[PDB]
Structure 1
Amino acid sequence: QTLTSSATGTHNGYYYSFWTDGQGNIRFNLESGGQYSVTWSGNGNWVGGKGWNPGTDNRVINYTADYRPNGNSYLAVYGWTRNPLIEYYVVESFGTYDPSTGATRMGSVTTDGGTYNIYRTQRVNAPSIEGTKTFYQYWSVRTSKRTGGTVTMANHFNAWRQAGLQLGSHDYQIVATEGYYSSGSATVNVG
């Protein structure tokens, strides 16, 4: 099951979402259980992974990953909420581009053996699950990169909410890999 375009659905019990601007080279493959693998290069913009839909406030995610990025790429819990429309990330690892760059710092949170700095950014007239919109992005960026472990979402959501970053109703919630004008390979197994 190799994707040929942006797509969503459920595979082996796990929701999957793959979004691509169709550029560059990419092969996103749905694999056994909660696993997926992706190989990419060129000048593409994409993000995809496996997880759940809808996401929940207290989900405890356990994942493993063989992550090998080259350029601007992220390995992170990724999802959206509506009312308000929010795109959020719990960055476990990243490439050459630090998501915190020029972002508004909103404190930090210690959870699952790690420490994460919190940030808020904004996307204007950008693609979203509701079409072209202007919305905020919330971030939890690990101070030390890792490619496997447990992520207690309640600790991140509560840290954001308390910092004044409101969350809406949950849309999807996945362990995603993202890339922008980058290359690499990744095999991620959720659950």
Structure 2
Amino acid sequence: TIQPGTGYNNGYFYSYWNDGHGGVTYTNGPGGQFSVNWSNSGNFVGGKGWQPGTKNKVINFSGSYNPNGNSYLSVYGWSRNPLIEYFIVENFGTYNPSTGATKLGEVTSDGSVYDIYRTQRVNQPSIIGTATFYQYWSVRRNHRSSGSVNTANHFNAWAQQGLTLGTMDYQIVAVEGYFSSGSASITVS
């Protein structure tokens, strides 16, 4: 179990962030593996990957993902200039994060159609401090907890729709939770 923060573990970048509410434990394992155990958490996001990411990375993930409540399993990252938080959502719990969001297209990648959306965060935490910024989403129709994500198909489809990314910051496979419980064990490569 570790301190919220960022760093390197067994050759992989990792980021673990939480809102301080309690109820979540995050552990880095061998190679690209990480685990999350949570019970009546607050908001948190953690996982392993790269710093910086790239715009054509093929990201592999495998393992188990057992949310009980509001949680996502995604390729997750940021761009700077413009500041964007992005999600390629492979699975989720009780809440589809695109609920109520305006659909901006579709993309077929890695065995499923994904629906594309843009949302906005207003005065929220970010990699550069409190800010207002857009979020980009690709939400997989066919849920899974292992697979391969060709990020270029998503970033290209987003750009085509007017959802442009700046310079890549970190890029991870992440478990996110919002006031929920669950367990997950995921290996990245």
Q: Which amino acid aligns with 2:12?
A: Y
Equivalent in the alignment of 1:3: 2
2: CA distance, partners of 1:21 / 1:100: 22
Q: CA RMSD in A?
A: 0.7
TM-score (norm 1): 0.97
1: CA distance, partners of 2:32 / 2:11: 8
What secondary structure does 2:154 align onto? helix
Gaps of 5+ in 1: none
Alignment of 1:39-188 (within 5 A): 39-188=37-186
Equivalent in the alignment of 1:29: 27
How big is each residue's C-alpha offset from its partner over 1:92-114, in whole Å with a ceiling of 9 and x where there is no partner?
00010111111121101001111
2: CA distance, partners of 1:143 / 1:113: 10
2: CA distance, partners of 1:65 / 1:176: 12
- CA positional deviation for 1:144: 1.5
2: CA distance, partners of 1:141 / 1:176: 14
- CA positional deviation for 1:43: 3.6
What secondary structure does 1:175 align onto? strand
Q: Which amino acid aligns with 1:120?
A: R
- CA positional deviation for 1:178: 0.3
TM-score (norm 2): 0.98
Contact 2:41 2:177 in 1 (8 A): no
Contact 2:68 2:181 in 1 (8 A): yes
Q: Which amino acid aligns with 1:144?
A: N
What secondary structure does 1:84 align onto? coil
Gaps of 5+ in 2: none
How big is each residue's C-alpha offset from its partner over 1:81-130, in whole Å with a ceiling of 9 and x where there is no partner?
00000000000000101111111211010011111000000000000001
- CA positional deviation for 1:24: 2.8
Q: Which amino acid aligns with 2:123?
A: N
2: CA distance, partners of 1:66 / 1:111: 21
2: CA distance, partners of 1:71 / 1:188: 19
1: CA distance, partners of 2:8 / 2:140: 29
What secondary structure does 1:145 align onto? coil
Which stretch shows the higher mean deviation, 34-43 or 165-174? 34-43
What secondary structure does 2:179 align onto? strand
